[PDB]
Design a protein around this ligand. Structure first.
Ligand code: BCL
Ligand code: BCL
Ligand code: BCL
Ligand code: BCL
Ligand code: BPH
Ligand code: BPH
Ligand code: UQ7
Ligand code: SPN
Ligand code: OLC
Ligand code: LDA
Ligand code: LDA
Ligand code: LDA
Ligand code: LDA
Ligand code: LDA
Ligand code: LDA
Ligand code: LDA
Ligand code: LDA
Ligand code: CL
Ligand code: FE
Lengths: 300, 240, 281
């Protein structure tokens, strides 16, 4: 029996230059090459891509953030390429020491460079957010993408900007480094009396687990009804077909209730955004309101 | 009652309202619940029916308001097997021809789905300028074999989802000269043949036909795909 | 009660066991043979949990905890109160989970759909058995399994992880985490995209799937497609759980030291191992 995990026969035609709507066609690149590799799993067409001020700004600002961390790593490596590759995951660009508080006066080697990198990351992420809004807007679509992105930004803002300010020291922010930011995560839990007992942390885990649960359910469901064209979900919303009916009834017969072709995507978007929405709350409260989650938990 | 306790209590209240909202939004199709005789069921659950919403369909195709007066808009050739509720309803005739059970189809609009520009989303490759097979086995010309290991016909064309550049049906020529569409997800393209495990060779003629050689409507797709999937249960007696 | 469109699907057939004996529904739930089995295992397992609560002396669900046998018991049986209840409940939970998956299969057959859903559910089951069966057996005692308690089973995660330093450095653990994060990222984008097309700006007609493709090409220069994203979500979530069971099946069985030491191979390669400078110089 065919399972529809990989395309059996790829087909290719003229590149699809895409819908126009109110998109400024001046900022669209040409079409890229087709990828037979990607064609086995999804679409083979690469490009075009829209490139505006925000995209150029986000892209450039992002590279500067990347390059700032890069030359710090080369400096830590003594400019030796061998040392660079050996200790790559061990390098780290740390925030200013607690002595500097929220001052931007820290020397470059003493956390000033971390501040410069964070500025470029700040510009890159926020200019990229406005990009997810304006691209949907140009096509007349809803802004669900930009709002879902805000949830991820919210946790990122708490970790490196909001909470450090409320704590009164940039030293509370996360360092730029592969292993170093893993070490930061572990120390954060120990300092705050075990995050396992932060209820917003447990909620965040429930939605993270639940996101894998729901996408496995939904991905498997759509593939099981792709023999009825169930992946064409927009037309199934406008004109319910046997795919939407069999998908709903499988779950009704299994667990007693079911979704619609549209409604399941509201379950999905909320299951996912709640991960970082509750997570950011839990982190924001750690150290500002609660110093020991285990001890706090014993009284509630 | 510190700020943390207030936040976690506030969130649980929010999550309850969110679940209530999500569940009602997922009740815009198939509700209200019915008894097995079609009448409204007395117990509809604790969640109320949502208030109507309107989609404005593109290409002047009208507007959809859901929820709204439901209707199958087709006869159902089934009959109760029990006085009490909760038992299967048995086909009264040929379930594959009557389109019941795994062979069910929905009375979708008898129009083809359209792409963003108002053109037919699915077309035969012979009518799709520039489209071709770019990887894998090209099934055109191959014989089509049923679960009885008999040959039912020959692949003569591929119907392509143009916006997605995806094969969705195989057009198969039967021994009588006519053709039928086969869901791409229900065939196995091999080196020398196409094998269809859902149908026996003599059940291909029973696949519903399309009224136009260069397009297929949503209703036609549902009748075709339902019939083929129904063969898994109803064509099994002659499945080697 | 039925959905408005449900009757035509409620036909007989599709069972794997018992023919038409259990081929019926209770309200919305389909029963079938494995629906009866599920109920039997589930009922028995819940009775044993209530029993363990009586022995424990509390009915507060936050405090109830069924512990596995002590390490000294090895892989043999233990008395009900000294770990036997955990053993029997573990049997019942397995019976319930597997029966649930076979019930889903019978529902797939009656509806004539693919078997992707129970196949995906089997990965979660494999992860469960990795923690309560495969890893304890390979290590030589049921006591290495985790206890059945809301909070005690979090303490087991913490105690197990810190036995190997920071479990973050478990390289399979990193891969599994990447799939969990990426999956949630993909789930959020997919749900947002369908909704943004089905619910466009005010004064706009419903969008088409071509708009979905165009939006993502404009954004990152590539669209995986309507079918591809459902393949992707299924793959991200199952791979996440696959590498989870992998990062544990190897912990305490073929790896026993702190997981940070695993990375010393890359560092102390005899060529750049001794070069002065850097973090490791
Ligand atoms: C996965 C790796 C670890 C582990 C690490 C963690 C960590 C770390 C956390 C949890 C958390 C939870 N875990 Mg645990 N957990 C494991 C194995 C399990 C198993 C199991 C049978 O294997 C179960 C049933 C649970 C159950 C639970 C819930 C009590 C809670 C929320 C999970 C959730 O929503 O997931 C996604 C699933 C859904 C959204 C679907 C709905 C699932 C519901 C909520 C399950 C309820 C189970 C019920 C309380 C127990 C059985 C009741 C019977 C009727 C007797 N864990 C193993 C040992 N688990 C979090 C918590 O808050 O704990 C207090 C938390 O922080
Ligand atoms: C010792 C370790 C501690 C612990 C310490 C922490 C800490 C500390 C934190 C978490 C957090 C999380 N933990 Mg914990 N955690 C522990 C144990 C667990 C266990 C477990 C099995 O026991 C589990 C399952 C979890 C699970 C989780 C997640 C639910 C949560 C992260 C959400 C997320 O998606 O972040 C990933 C998403 C983001 C980081 C958002 C970032 C998005 C930004 C905007 C994008 C970056 C753009 C950038 C430029 C990208 C590159 C560009 C390229 C072009 C691609 N923890 C133990 C007790 N955990 C977080 C949380 O919310 O806690 C409440 C957190 O801060
Ligand atoms: C949530 C609590 C901790 C944390 C704990 C962990 C843990 C634990 C792990 C990671 C892992 C990763 N984290 Mg981290 N991480 C945090 C915040 C961040 C931020 C941020 C914007 O704040 C960034 C850019 C990253 C970046 C990354 C990558 C290096 C890596 C896989 C990312 C992923 O799944 O991407 C999804 C995005 C894409 C695929 C887009 C392309 N982390 C916070 C501070 N992170 C994993 C890893 O491999 O570490 C070596 C890992 O095991
Ligand atoms: C202090 C703790 C340690 C640590 C130690 C461990 C240990 C120890 C383990 C993990 C494991 C995991 N960790 Mg770690 N981990 C830490 C920090 C993290 C961080 C972080 C941000 O810091 C993250 C993101 C993670 C992430 C993860 C995942 C990769 C994984 C859990 C998912 C899983 O296996 O699901 C698998 C899914 C299941 C087990 C669910 C099965 C459900 C069954 C089949 C059905 C249940 C039905 C239910 C009872 C019915 C209820 C019905 C009612 C109607 C509701 N860890 C720190 C460093 N981590 C776990 C793992 O890999 O396990 C394999 C694990 O055991
Ligand atoms: C809401 C919960 C999850 C989420 C959602 C999310 N992320 C998003 C979005 C959304 C809805 C976007 O719209 C945006 C995007 O364009 O994705 C393709 C993005 C994005 N999430 C990204 C990464 C990312 N998201 C993460 C996590 C999450 N994102 C959560 C798990 C993580 C981690 C650490 O887990 C990472 C590394 C980028 C691929 C992209 C933002 C691109 C950006 O800001 O680029 C600027 C920088 C340079 C160009 C350099
Ligand atoms: C593999 C990818 C992800 C996934 C997928 C997945 N899960 C699934 C499915 C799929 C595809 C289903 O089809 C199936 C379903 O029907 O979901 C609605 C299911 C399911 N996943 C569930 C839960 C679940 N999945 C999880 C995870 C995941 N599921 C993965 C992340 C998790 C966690 C911890 O992350 C949980 C808690 C259930 C809602 C459901 C399976 C229901 C089932 O099997 O019911 C039969 C059993 C009972 C009704 C009760 C039995 C009770 C026992 C006898 C006693 C209790 C034993 C247990 C050990 C107690 C311990 C509790 C403590 C740890 C607190
Ligand atoms: C596009 O197509 C799709 C649909 O339709 C169009 C859907 O409908 C769904 C289903 C998804 C949802 C409804 C969203 C909500 C689900 C979540 C959050 C998952 C988490 C769910 C839960 C926690 C609920 C779990 C419920 C149970 C395990 C049921 C409890 C068990 C009972 C009552 C026992 C089972 C009964 C029997 C065995 C029969 C009785 C037997 C006897 C002998 C008496 C998906 C994925 C989908 O793609
Ligand atoms: C050949 O190599 C060259 C040199 C070319 C390279 O390019 C090498 C480059 C690398 C090897 C890249 C290495 C990169 C990393 C290891 C990145 C690691 C990052 C993480 C693990 C994630 C940490 C991010 C979390 C934090 C701390 C985010 C901070 C963001 C804040 C929300 C913004 C805070 C803003 C501040 C403090 C002020 C700025 C101004 C404002 C107005 C806000
Ligand atoms: C691929 C190399 C070229 C550059 C790539 C840059 C990075 C992004 C890559 C893949 C995005 C995968 C999709 C992630 C989420 C998609 C959400 C969705 O639903 O998309 C389906 C489809 O695209 C709408 O019809
Ligand atoms: C902070 C995360 C919020 C979750 C996102 C939920 C979006 C639902 C609201 C739709 C808004 C779309 N609109 C009207 C702007 O086009
Ligand atoms: C949108 C889906 C909602 C699912 C809700 C699941 C709730 C899980 C309960 C986890 C327990 C959290 N807490 C506060 C005790 O740590
Ligand atoms: C917190 C998880 C609980 C979710 C399980 C809900 C039970 C299934 C839905 C109701 C089935 C019975 N009903 C109401 C239709 O008669
Ligand atoms: C006294 C205030 C305590 C904090 C409240 C936390 C719960 C609110 C979370 C939902 C935020 C609303 N939103 C933006 C997601 O729609
Ligand atoms: C802090 C909020 C207090 C609780 C009130 C919230 C309950 C309703 C939840 C609204 C979610 C619905 N919506 C439309 C925004 O998606
Ligand atoms: C895990 C969070 C999900 C909670 C489940 C809430 C939905 C239950 C709906 C039951 C009513 C369904 N019914 C009978 C009207 O079809
Ligand atoms: C019904 C299928 C169950 C097969 C796998 C169950 C594993 C249970 C692990 C506990 C074993 C305890 N015992 C009886 C060997 O002492
Ligand atoms: C651990 C239990 C695993 C159950 C899930 C099995 C999924 C595959 C289903 C294929 C069924 C094939 N067959 C011959 C019964 O039709
Ligand atoms: Cl732009
Ligand atoms: Fe979908």
């Amino acid at each position: 029996e065919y399972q529809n995990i990989f395309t059996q026969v790829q087909v290719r035609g003229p590149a699809d230059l895409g819908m126009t709507e109110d998109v400024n066609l001046a900022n669209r690149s040409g079409v890229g090459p087709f990828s037979t590799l990607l064609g086995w799993f999804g679409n083979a067409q690469l490009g075009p891509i829209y490139l505006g001020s925000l995209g150029v700004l986000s892209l450039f600002s992002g590279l500067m953030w990347f390059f700032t961390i890069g030359i710090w790593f080369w400096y830590q490596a003594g400019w030796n390429p061998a040392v660079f590759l050996r200790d790559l995951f061990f390098f780290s660009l740390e925030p200013p020491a607690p002595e500097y508080g929220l001052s931007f006066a820290a020397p470059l080697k003493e956390g000033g460079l971390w501040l410069i990198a964070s500025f470029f990351m700040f510009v890159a992420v926020w200019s990229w957010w406005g990009r997810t809004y304006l691209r949907a807007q140009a096509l007349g679509m809803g802004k669900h993408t930009a709002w879902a992105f805000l949830s991820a930004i919210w946790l990122w803002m708490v970790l490196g900007f909001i909470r450090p300010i409320l704590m009164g020291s940039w030293s509370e922010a996360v360092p730029y480094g592969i292993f170093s930011h893993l070490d930061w995560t572990n120390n954060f839990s120990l300092v705050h009396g075990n995050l396992h007992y932060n209820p917003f942390h447990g909620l965040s885990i429930a939605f993270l687990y639940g996101s894998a649960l729901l996408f496995a359910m939904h991905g498997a469901t759509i593939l099981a009804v792709s023999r009825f064209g169930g992946e064409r979900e927009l037309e199934q919303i406008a004109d319910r077909g046997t795919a939407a009916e069999r998908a709903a009834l499988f779950w009704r017969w299994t667990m007693g209730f079911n979704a619609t072709m549209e409604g399941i995507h509201r379950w999905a978007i909320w299951m996912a955004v709640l991960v970082t929405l509750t997570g950011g709350i839990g982190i924001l409260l750690s150290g500002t309101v609660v110093d020991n989650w285990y001890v706090w938990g014993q009284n509630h | 009652f510190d700020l943390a306790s207030l936040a976690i209590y506030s969130f649980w209240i929010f999550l309850a309202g969110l679940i209530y909202y999500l569940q009602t939004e997922n009740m815009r199709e198939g509700y209200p619940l019915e008894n097995e005789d079609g009448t409204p069921a007395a117990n509809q659950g604790p969640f109320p029916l949502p208030k109507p919403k309107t989609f404005i369909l593109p290409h002047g195709r009208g507007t959809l308001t859901v929820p709204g007066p439901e209707s199958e808009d087709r006869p159902i050739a089934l009959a109760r097997t029990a006085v009490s509720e909760g038992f299967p309803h048995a086909p009264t005739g040929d379930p594959m021809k009557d389109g019941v059970g795994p062979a069910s189809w929905v009375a979708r609009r008898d129009l083809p789905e359209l792409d963003g520009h108002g053109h037919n989303k699915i077309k035969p490759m012979k009518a799709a300028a520039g489209f071709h097979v770019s990887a894998g086995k090209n099934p055109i010309g191959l014989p089509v074999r049923g679960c009885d290991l008999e040959i039912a016909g020959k692949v003569v064309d591929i119907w392509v989802d143009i916006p997605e550049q995806m094969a969705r049906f195989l057009e198969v020529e039967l021994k009588d000269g006519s053709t039928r569409l086969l869901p791409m997800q229900m065939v196995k393209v091999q080196s020398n043949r196409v094998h269809v495990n859902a149908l026996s060779s003599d059940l291909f003629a029973g696949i519903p036909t399309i009224k136009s050689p260069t397009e297929v409507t949503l209703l036609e797709e549902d009748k075709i795909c339902g019939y083929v999937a129904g063969g898994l249960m109803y064509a099994a007696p002659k499945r080697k | 009660a039925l959905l408005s469109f449900e009757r035509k699907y409620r036909v007989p057939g599709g069972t794997l066991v018992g023919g038409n004996l259990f081929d019926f529904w209770v309200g919305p739930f389909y029963v079938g043979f494995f629906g009866v089995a599920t109920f039997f295992f589930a009922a028995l397992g819940i009775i044993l949990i209530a029993w363990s609560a009586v022995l424990q002396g509390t009915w507060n669900p936050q405090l109830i905890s069924v512990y596995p046998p002590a390490l000294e018991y090895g892989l043999g049986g233990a008395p009900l109160a000294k770990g036997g209840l955990w053993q029997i409940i573990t049997i019942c939970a397995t019976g319930a989970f597997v029966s649930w998956a076979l019930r889903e299969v019978e529902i797939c057959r009656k509806l004539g759909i693919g078997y992707h859903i129970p196949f995906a559910f089997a990965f979660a089951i494999l992860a469960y058995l990795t923690l309560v069966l495969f890893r304890p057996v390979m290590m030589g005692a049921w006591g290495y399994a985790f206890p059945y308690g809301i909070w005690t089973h979090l303490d087991w995660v913490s105690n197990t992880g810190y036995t190997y330093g920071n479990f973050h450095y478990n390289p399979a653990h990193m891969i599994a985490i990447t799939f969990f994060f990426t999956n949630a990222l993909a789930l959020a984008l997919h749900g947002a995209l369908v909704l943004s097309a089905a619910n466009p700006e005010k004064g706009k007609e419903m969008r088409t799937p071509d708009h979905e493709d165009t939006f993502f090409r404009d954004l990152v220069g590539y669209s995986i497609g309507t079918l591809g994203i459902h393949r992707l979500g299924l793959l991200l979530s199952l791979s996440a759980v696959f590498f989870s069971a992998l990062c544990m099946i190897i912990t305490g069985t073929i790896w026993f030291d702190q997981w940070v030491d695993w990375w010393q191979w890359w560092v102390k390669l005899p060529w750049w191992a001794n070069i002065p400078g850097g973090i490791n110089g």
